[PDB]
Structures are given as C-alpha cells and as structure tokens.
Amino acid sequence: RGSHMTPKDDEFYQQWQLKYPKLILREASSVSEELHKEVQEAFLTLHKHGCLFRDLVRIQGKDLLTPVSRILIGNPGCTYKYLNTRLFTVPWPVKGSKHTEAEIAAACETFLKLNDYLQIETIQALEELAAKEKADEVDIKSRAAYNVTLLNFMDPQKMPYLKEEPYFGMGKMAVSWHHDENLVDRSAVAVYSYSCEGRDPDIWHVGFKISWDIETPGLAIPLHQGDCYFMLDDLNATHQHCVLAGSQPRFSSTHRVAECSTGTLDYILQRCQLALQNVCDDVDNDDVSLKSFEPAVLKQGEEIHNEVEFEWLRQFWFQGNRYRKCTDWWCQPMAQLEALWKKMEGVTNAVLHEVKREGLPVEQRNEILTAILASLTARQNLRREWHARCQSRIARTLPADQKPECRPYWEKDDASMPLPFDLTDIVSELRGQLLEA
C-alpha cells in the first residue's frame, strides 16, 4: 500500500530526518514582511502583463504543453534547457548591464534581490550541512550561485486537467514527478512559494520520493504564503519531486544554478567566431571562400553550424516571438546569430563546391565527406523534426501571441539562399560518392 506522510503523521519528522535530510524548510515567518510584499506584487505584475506561458516541451517523442505557465528570469545572456526546450532569460538588473518595460523591469529587479536573499540562506544551510557531517567554501559558493529562476503559475480553476499522483495517493499534480535538469552538479535549488487565499487537497504541497523507490513513503510538504524550501546538495539527483496542486491560484520562484557552459550568448558567439575563422573575412558578401579544407576544421565548422541552428535559432523561434512581450534583450543578438548562421550556410555551400570539383583527388574528397557527413545528416534529421514540431496539432492551438515559427526556413525558389532547406538529395549524393569503388 503506497502511502505518503504529512506533518499530521507521527513518523513524518523522523522520516524527514532519516530519508530526506537535504530538504530544508524555511517558514514564511523567516522572510521579512517587506520582501514578501514586493515579491508577491512582482508575481501579480508579471501575470497582469501576461508574461507567463505554458511551455510546449517534448517528452518521450511527444509534444506536450505544461499545465503550469512559466517564465525564466536571470543573468542576461543565459539559458535554461529542459524537456528539449531552451528557455531564454528575461534579464534581471545584474551589475554592469533598456530592454524591458517599467513594471516588468521592476519585477525582475525584485526577483534579483529575492535571488540574493535565498542565496545567502542557501549558503548558511550548506555550511550547517557540512558542520553536521564529520561529527570547500568555494564549492559551497558556486553551488549556491543562482543564475536564474523559473517562475511557475497555475490557477487550478482555469487549469483543471491535472493528473493524479500515481504512487502515494498525493492527489492532483500541478507538476509531475521529475528531477530538475541542466543543473550544476550538487547545486542547490531554492523555492519561494506563493499561494493565494492524507494531504489537504485544498493546499499546495511539494512532493518528494526517493529515486527508484515507491515503497518508502513519499513526503508531502504543505506550502503556504511565503514558505520557502531548499533542495541541497545531491537531493535533486537522489530524489524526485512534484508539485501537488491545491485549489487556489499559486506562484513559485525556483532559483537554480543552471549548467550553462554551452548555454550563454557569449559562448555561442564565441563558437560562431571560431567557425568563421576558416573564412576569408575581408568583406561581408556571398562569395564565401575558405582558408582550409582540413578534415578537422570542416568537421568543426559544420558542427558549430548545427549548434547555432538548432540549439539557438530554432529553439528561440519555436517559442517565439513570445518573450518579446517582456523584453527586447534578445532581438539584436538573435539577428546576429542568424547573420552568422547564414554565413555558415555559405561555408557549407563552399565545402560542397570544393568536393564537387575536377582536380580534387578522390582521396582528399573522401576525407572531406567523412568529416562532414555525420553533421549534414544530423542537419537534415533535426530539420525534419523541428519543422514537424512547429506544425503539430497543439503548436497550431497556441495563440498568434506564441505561434511557433520554423525559422530559418526558405523555399527552393528563394535565390537569397545558397542551399536548399531539404538536404535529402545532397546527403544522398555524398553517400553515393563515398561508396564509389
């Protein structure tokens, strides 16, 4: 009989200490009045401005719209990827940084100082966690250094299509069992929970279970207005969590140390520069000339081409143009990444021209093909996929406000583009060439 425990159970606290000690609870009374007020107003102000969107994610080969509406706020340039969906931050006024609106801007600043507070609290609890055990400081710091927060909202009246928690009888899930993805290893998660206005169905909870385990009773922690909780250290790997919906509207701010080593603007721009190092860059025009046809440089060039195409452009435009409502931060850089990408289409075309010329001895030609074939095939496949993902029956359900675009995309007739969008014919011919005997 799979069951769960709440504070009403005799064994709840002992079971908390024994099998969920890296979960920590900070009651609303630990956070100042003024911060509570400011943070709640910020939630209401972002909601009023319609800044929260259910995400069209992908899970086990299926297109699925998250019951919760969400918004990512964090360090300018930074991204958070989950369920094959890359969220772009609406930026908060971090040091040394004209893109958002008055009220919206104010709300970001507010979640910034909320971030400062939780980070200090996270550091305290981690120091205490280390002090308990055995009965570096830089590790701690880095594992409390929240660079983003994913805000969640749900009005169970307006979103009643909630699944039943299937293992412990926790009732309705606002967010189903999961691990938070794309997180720096052993990094903490801090959560401020704002409700309006077995377990009490009417009240929001966060649920926890041990991974692989539905025999250990799950824990259901009641959240009220301003209660925060923290997942410390490896809790997020060793356990799964969910959100059990109550009956009133509720928000949360989930601060994370996103693992953005390949997930920031500066990083992708640097990779684009790396790739274009192989092109004569005296002038910006269509006659792309390449400096080298060394297998490794061409492989890299085509790989980066794929990276900016599908991890940045197609992602951004698939959700888009939707965070344009809250900010114009990404307009210019996404245009730039597209200009850099269009050049890479020029580069690919120049590689194809080089393989397709008379003088090239068969041996070097085959070198080139082998270096670029994996990338071009991944290009065709990821293009089919994204194009389908933009045209699914549920993408088309979304308002024009959030209509997914399949950009960049062009027809055959389009003279402005050197290569067709569909590479089936090209990839087929390269395969045949490599098979030539």
Ligand X SMILES: O=C(O)CNC(=O)C(=O)O
Residues that constitute the known binding site for Fe cation: 178, 180, 241
Is the preceding peptide bond at 408 cis, omega within 30 degrees of 0? Answer: yes
E strand or H helix at 148? strand 148-154
Q: What angle do CA 46, 267, 82 make, to 5 degrees?
A: 50
Show the tokens assigned to 180: 């938070």
Listed residue (186, 188, 157, 149) closest to 174, CA to CA: 157
Is position 227 an interface residue for ligand X (rule: CB under 6 A)? Answer: no
Of the candidate residues 39, 42, 72, 206, the single one contacting ligand X (CB under 6 A): 206
For residue 243, the minimal CB distance to ligand X (Å) is: 5
Q: What angle do CA 99, 103, 106 make, to 5 degrees?
A: 80
Listed residue (24, 259, 262) closest to 125, CA to CA: 24
Residues in the chain: 437
Listed residue (86, 78, 72) closest to 309, CA to CA: 86
Residues belonging to the binding site for 2-oxoglutarate are 152, 229, 250-252, 254, 256
Q: Residues 159-198: x/- map of binding to ligand X (CB under 6 A)?
A: ----------------x----x----------x-x-----
The smaller minimum CB distance to Ni ion, of residues 241 and 379, is found at 241
Show the tokens assigned to 202: 């009417």
Is position 219 an interface residue for ligand X (rule: CB under 6 A)? Answer: no
Instruction: Specify the stretch interacting with Ni ion by CB under 5 A; choose among 16-24, 174-182, 297-305, 335-343.
Output: 174-182
Q: What are the distances in angstroms from CA 359 to CA 120, 363, 364, 424?
A: 66, 11, 11, 26
Work out the angle between the directed axes of helices 102-132 and 33-48 (0-180°, nearest 10).
130
Q: For Ni ion, how many residues bind (rule: CB under 5 A)?
A: 1
Is position 55 an interface residue for Ni ion (rule: CB under 5 A)? Answer: no
Q: What are the distances in angstroms from CA 57 to CA 77, 83, 87, 244, 327?
A: 21, 6, 10, 20, 22
Instruction: Specify the stretch interacting with Ni ion by CB under 5 A; choose among 172-180, 361-369, 404-412, 418-426.
Output: 172-180
For residue 87, the minimal CB distance to ligand X (Å) is: 11
The DSSP secondary-structure symbol of 321 reads: S
Is position 233 an interface residue for Ni ion (rule: CB under 5 A)? Answer: no
Q: Which does 236 bind (CB under 5 to 8 A by kind): Ni ion, ligand X, none?
A: none
Is position 149 an interface residue for ligand X (rule: CB under 6 A)? Answer: no
For residue 31, the minimal CB distance to Ni ion (Å) is: 20
- State which of positions 231-290 bind ligand X (CB under 6 A): 241, 243, 252, 254
Per the listing, tokens 């004209």 go with 98
For residue 104, the minimal CB distance to ligand X (Å) is: 21
Q: Which does 206 bind (CB under 5 to 8 A by kind): ligand X, Ni ion, none?
A: ligand X
The smaller minimum CB distance to ligand X, of residues 179 and 403, is found at 179
For residue 368, the minimal CB distance to Ni ion (Å) is: 45
Is position 180 an interface residue for Ni ion (rule: CB under 5 A)? Answer: yes
For residue 393, the minimal CB distance to Ni ion (Å) is: 28
Show the tokens assigned to 391: 């045209």
CA–CA separation, 437 vs 212, rounded Å? 52
Strands 218-222, 4-5: pairing is parallel
Residues belonging to the binding site for substrate are 70, 82, 178-181
Q: Which does 264 bind (CB under 5 to 8 A by kind): ligand X, Ni ion, none?
A: none
> Which residues have a Cβ under 8 Å from the Cβ of 385 and sit 6 or more positions away?
none
The smaller minimum CB distance to Ni ion, of residues 180 and 233, is found at 180
For residue 180, the minimal CB distance to Ni ion (Å) is: 4
Residue 193's beta-bridge partner residues?
227, 252
The smaller minimum CB distance to ligand X, of residues 148 and 276, is found at 148
The smaller minimum CB distance to ligand X, of residues 254 and 315, is found at 254
Residues belonging to the binding site are 70, 82, 152, 178-181, 229, 241, 250-252, 254, 256
For residue 111, the minimal CB distance to Ni ion (Å) is: 17
- Centre a 10 Å sphere on the Cβ of residue 380 and count the other Cβ atoms it contains: 17
Show the tokens assigned to 361: 């001895």
What residues make contact with ligand X under the rule CB under 6 A? 150, 152, 175, 180, 191, 193, 206, 241, 243, 252, 254
What residues make contact with Ni ion under the rule CB under 5 A? 180
